[PDB]
């Protein structure tokens, strides 16, 4: 089966936000609103903001999961390639097969779904701390889009779901991801291709 990717703000007005990092050659993570697409280097910090209109209940959680974007690949589990799943880059918590990690959150939990075999990482939803108006989760993507035997140049989407304590849906948002060596250049190229089309 294929998890839903339908945008759903829900009762709490849940949606994502992204920094404005630009497209310089030195950028390691950059988000294109025109493409709804995050470009990032391998295993680099990807800040993703969570915005709500009202505070969800204690025990609300935030889950991230990757799926293939293309119709003909949506049913295939997104995982790390045969090389990276055997890398000695464990953080002590993420299973080595998981593409998406949460960085610097000891309450992150990693799920291997017993029925779909899909991977996800989930953290407690925290209120913005004093001063701030949103919360930020720091994600890492642990394979390249181009990795042979893994994503194999196929685009993926990340689906972020707001869930209650039972895992029921409260809100949903999503974005395409390209994990690549040159995020700034590739974002420039793809935004140009979009402008030409
Ligand atoms: Zn890989």
Curated annotation (Swiss-Prot):
Effect seen on changing residue 52 to I: In sporadic cancers; somatic mutation
Impact reported for residue 193 to Y: In sporadic cancers; somatic mutation
Effect of residue 146 to P: In sporadic cancers; somatic mutation
Protein name as it appears in the record: Cellular tumor antigen p53
Consequence of substituting residue 51 to R: In sporadic cancers; somatic mutation
Consequence when changing residue 11 to G: In a sporadic cancer; somatic mutation
Part of the whole protein covered: 96 to 292 of 393
Effect of residue 56 to L: In sporadic cancers; somatic mutation
Effect caused by changing residue 194 to R: In a sporadic cancer; somatic mutation
Annotated effect of mutating residue 152 to F: In a sporadic cancer; somatic mutation; requires 2 nucleotide substitutions
Effect of residue 181 to P: In sporadic cancers; somatic mutation
Effect seen on changing residue 190 to V: In sporadic cancers; somatic mutation
Effect of residue 119 to P: In a sporadic cancer; somatic mutation
Outcome following mutation: residue 162 to V: In sporadic cancers; somatic mutation
Result when mutating residue 89 to H: In sporadic cancers; somatic mutation
Organism annotation: Homo sapiens
């Amino acid at each position: 089966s294929v998890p839903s990717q339908k945008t759903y703000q829900g009762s709490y007005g849940f949606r994502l936000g992204f920094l404005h990092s630009g497209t310089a050659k030195s950028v390691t993570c950059t988000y294109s609103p025109a493409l709804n697409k995050l470009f990032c280097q391998l295993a680099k910090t990807c800040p993703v903001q969570l915005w709500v209109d009202s505070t969800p209940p204690p025990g609300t959680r935030v889950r991230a999961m990757a799926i293939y974007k293309q119709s003909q690949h949506m049913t295939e589990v997104v995982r790390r390639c045969p090389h990276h799943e055997r890398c000695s880059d464990s953080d002590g918590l993420a299973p080595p097969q998981h593409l998406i990690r949460v960085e610097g959150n000891l309450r992150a939990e990693y799920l291997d779904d017993r029925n779909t075999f899909r991977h996800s990482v989930v953290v407690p939803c925290e209120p913005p701390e004093v001063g701030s108006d949103c919360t930020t989760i720091h994600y890492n993507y642990m394979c390249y889009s181009s990795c042979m035997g893994g994503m194999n140049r196929r685009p993926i989407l990340t689906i972020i779901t707001l869930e209650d304590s039972s895992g029921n849906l409260l809100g949903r948002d999503s974005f395409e991801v390209r994990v690549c060596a040159c995020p700034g250049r590739d974002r420039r190229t793809e935004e140009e291709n979009l402008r030409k089309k």
